[PDB]
Amino acid sequence: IVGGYTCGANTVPYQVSLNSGYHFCGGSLINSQWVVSAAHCYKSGIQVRLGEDNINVVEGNEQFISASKSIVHPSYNSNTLNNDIMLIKLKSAASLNSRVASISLPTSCASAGTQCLISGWGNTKSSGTSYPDVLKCLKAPILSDSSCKSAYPGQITSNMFCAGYLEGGKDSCQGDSGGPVVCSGKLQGIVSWGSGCAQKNKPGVYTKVCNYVSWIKQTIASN
Numbered sequence: 001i002v003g004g005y006t007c008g009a010n011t012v013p014y015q016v017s018l019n020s021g022y023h024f025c026g027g028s029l030i031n032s033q034w035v036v037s038a039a040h041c042y043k044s045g046i047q048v049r050l051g052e053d054n055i056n057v058v059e060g061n062e063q064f065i066s067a068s069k070s071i072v073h074p075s076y077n078s079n080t081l082n083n084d085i086m087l088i089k090l091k092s093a094a095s096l097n098s099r100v101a102s103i104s105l106p107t108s109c110a111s112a113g114t115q116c117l118i119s120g121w122g123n124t125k126s127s128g129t130s131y132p133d134v135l136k137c138l139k140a141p142i143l144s145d146s147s148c149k150s151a152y153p154g155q156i157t158s159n160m161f162c163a164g165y166l167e168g169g170k171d172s173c174q175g176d177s178g179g180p181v182v183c184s185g186k187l188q189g190i191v192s193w194g195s196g197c198a199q200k201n202k203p204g205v206y207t208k209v210c211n212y213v214s215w216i217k218q219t220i221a222s223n
């Protein structure tokens, strides 16, 4: 997260770190045994880390649970990033409390102008590289589809939206991938892609979660 703020320990209780020996992606806990992330975060040997603040220090509220299976969206295209969504099932159910909690799925899509909270342990620099150890947060508005498409001609599908600031300086970044965009207590987006980070006229592009609620629910119901 570039141009954001320190969230505070366990203030974003649905935020997960995906770990394969090191943090590589964020995710969102949607019930005691399922996490939603980006399909571009797919890999084998994922351990899900809940209750994290400093990802480099055991602080007392962590739950580390290995993934038993991952399900990439049936229509995920790695070249266009269309349908950039994946479900991850935990080997055992997480213990839910105030610091480790699921986030609600949307029942309808959010509108341009809605403020959302975007979070993760990704790069904090728009030019260099600096990875924070503690969770970072950014409040950002959803942008109009017209401004999104103008920013990224020929690349924005109906399963994507932009959020952030066309002036630059405030954005998600590498390492935030797969993490949450939460608007009025609902998971509306997943950190998906962008041109660099926090660049002028290049806002973050997010997976449009409301389009996937039917698939998420049916998938969970049978797996």
Ligand SMILES: CN1CCC(O/N=C/c2ccc(C(=N)N)cc2)CC1
Binding pocket: 040, 171, 172, 173, 174, 175, 176, 177, 191, 192, 193, 194, 195, 196, 197, 198, 202, 203, 204, 205
């Ligand atoms: C496999 N793999 C693809 C490249 C990189 O992922 N990049 C993610 C990303 C997310 C958000 C933004 C942004 N909001 N500007 C920019 C970039 C690392 C993971």
Ligand SMILES: [Ca+2]
Binding pocket: 052, 053, 054, 055, 056, 057, 058, 059, 062
């Ligand atoms: Ca920790």
